[PDB]
Amino acid sequence: PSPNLPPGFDFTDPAIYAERLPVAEFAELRSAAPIWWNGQDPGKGGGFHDGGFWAITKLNDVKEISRHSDVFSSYENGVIPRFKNDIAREDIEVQRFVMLNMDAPHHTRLRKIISRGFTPRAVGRLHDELQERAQKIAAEAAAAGSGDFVEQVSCELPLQAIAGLLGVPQEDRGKLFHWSNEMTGNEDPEYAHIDPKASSAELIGYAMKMAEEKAKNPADDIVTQLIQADIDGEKLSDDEFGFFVVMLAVAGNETTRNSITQGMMAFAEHPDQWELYKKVRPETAADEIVRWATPVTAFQRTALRDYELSGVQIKKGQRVVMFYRSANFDEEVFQDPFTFNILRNPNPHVGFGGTGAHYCIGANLARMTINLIFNAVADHMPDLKPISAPERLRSGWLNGIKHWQVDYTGR
Ligand code: HEM
Ligand SMILES: NCc1ccc(-c2csnn2)cc1
Ligand SMILES: [Cl-]
Ligand SMILES: [Cl-]
Numbered sequence: 137p138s139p140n141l142p143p144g145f146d147f148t149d150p151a152i153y154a155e156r157l158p159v160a161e162f163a164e165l166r167s168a169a170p171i172w173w174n175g176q177d178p179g180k181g182g183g184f185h186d187g188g189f190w191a192i193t194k195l196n197d198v199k200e201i202s203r204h205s206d207v208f209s210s211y212e213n214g215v216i217p218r219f220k221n222d223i224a225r226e227d228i229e230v231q232r233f234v235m236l237n238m239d240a241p242h243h244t245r246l247r248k249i250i251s252r253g254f255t256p257r258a259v260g261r262l263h264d265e266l267q268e269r270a271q272k273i274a275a276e277a278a279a280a281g282s283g284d285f286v287e288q289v290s291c292e293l294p295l296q297a298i299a300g301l302l303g304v305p306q307e308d309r310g311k312l313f314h315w316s317n318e319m320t321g322n323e324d325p326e327y328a329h330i331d332p333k334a335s336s337a338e339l340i341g342y343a344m345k346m347a348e349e350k351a352k353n354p355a356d357d358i359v360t361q362l363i364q365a366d367i368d369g370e371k372l373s374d375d376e377f378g379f380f381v382v383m384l385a386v387a388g389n390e391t392t393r394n395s396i397t398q399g400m401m402a403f404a405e406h407p408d409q410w411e412l413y414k415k416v417r418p419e420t421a422a423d424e425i426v427r428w429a430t431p432v433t434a435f436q437r438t439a440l441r442d443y444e445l446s447g448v449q450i451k452k453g454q455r456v457v458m459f460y461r462s463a464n465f466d467e468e469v470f471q472d473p474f475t476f477n478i479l480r481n482p483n484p485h486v487g488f489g490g491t492g493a494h495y496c497i498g499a500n501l502a503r504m505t506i507n508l509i510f511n512a513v514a515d516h517m518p519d520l521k522p523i524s525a526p527e528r529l530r531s532g533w534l535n536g537i538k539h540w541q542v543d544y545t546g547r
């Protein structure tokens with residue numbers, strides 16, 4: 137029995153996400169076709185011209201794909217499953233220069249370097265400054281009375297986390313934030329004029345100058361650990377540091393922003409969870425917010441060989457698309473997946489991906505950012521109330537909120 141979906145439905149269609157999350161449609165796949173061939177008409181594959189892909193909807197299959205990175209490649213077609221239909225193949229392949237789109241052994245070496253400086257100690261060293269910034273953000277928003285929660289609450293702390301991790305001078309954070317924002321959303325009419333390639337090139341140029349500067353003056357950041365040779369002489373070259381900065385700018389900005397916006401949307405819809413949060417301030421809330429928000433709807437892989445997955449024969453060369461938005465509501469893993477429960481524990485969501493080689497290196501920085509901003513929201517605008525419905529982002533793989541009008545003082 138085929139799944140009850142409209143003919144030609146494409147779960148990476150940006151026109152869907154501009155209006156809604158296809159929650160009923162994912163639930164139908166989980167019940168009737170948990171691994172399902174998503175066909176794509178000629179020229180309508182978002183930059184891929186292979187006839188379609190396997191939709192992966194169950195959490196255990198997402199973990200299996202993610203852990204078998206020897207078979208399911210990030211490099212072969214990159215991990216973003218949807219671009220503009222007319223994107224040039226060369227513009228997909230240039231994305232192989234960021235760690236996200238690399239396979240072992242190249243990925244292994246680069247991740248080892250990135251992780252010697254990107255440690256729990258390094259992240260914890262940002263706690264106090266990000267806490268001060270979160271309190272300032274929430275106080276200034278509340279002072280405004282009403283406004284766009286996305287812009288006045290959600291946007292700034294994730295960017296300041298990237299700046300503090302890298303030790304970016306305060307005078308440069310404006311342009312750093314500009315470049316980061318220019319590298320996502322280009323399929324939405326509101327952002328039709330951004331140029332992510334041009335922005336990435338400007339950020340690489342900036343980052344390579346940073347690498348040369350911070351080599352002369354080591355400072356209390358991660359850059360020095362990254363650009364300094366270890367025992368084996370392993371280190372990021374200046375251009376590798378540049379591609380890492382591009383990586384961070386695109387990985388840790390709008391993802392965390394959208395988790396914050398949709399976290400507060402969830403609190404607005406579940407007042408009892410908001411009351412509980414304000415009283416207990418449970419840090420388990422961050423993981424339930426990421427599960428609920430699933431800011432990356434999906435990443436893909438490409439089979440390097442034939443592989444049988446939960447009884448379905450994946451063929452060499454075929455793409456599999458891991459729908460984290462479906463897996464995070466998998467009835468076989470979660471008790472009451474469609475209950476927003478900030479005390480959920482353990483919370484084995486895959487909002488940060490399936491376990492394995494590419495697991496989000498910023499997961500704990502993201503959780504800390506979320507916990508700090510929601511404490512600040514609780515401290516300064518405990519009675520906020522939405523004014524109008526969120527405006528969603530036209531994207532085929534990112535779950536974004538562009539704007540959300542709220543009354544911070546609660547009438
Ligand atoms: C709630 C916010 C975030 C979400 C939902 C998220 C999600 C993800 C996902 C789904 C992946 C791919 C994992 C996989 O394929 O197995 C990933 C990888 C990555 N994330 Fe995050 N992320 C978030 C925040 C951040 C932040 C704040 C940073 C750094 C400041 C960051 C840096 C990275 C990097 C560098 C990678 C690539 C790791 C690799 O390929 O080895 N992310 N993230
Ligand atoms: N942290 C998850 C994440 C990683 C890379 C991207 C991204 C956006 S454009 N190229 N890569 C977005 C989100
Ligand atoms: Cl293709
Ligand atoms: Cl088109």
Ligand SMILES: [Cl-]
Binds near residue numbers: 469480481483
């Ligand atoms: Cl659960």
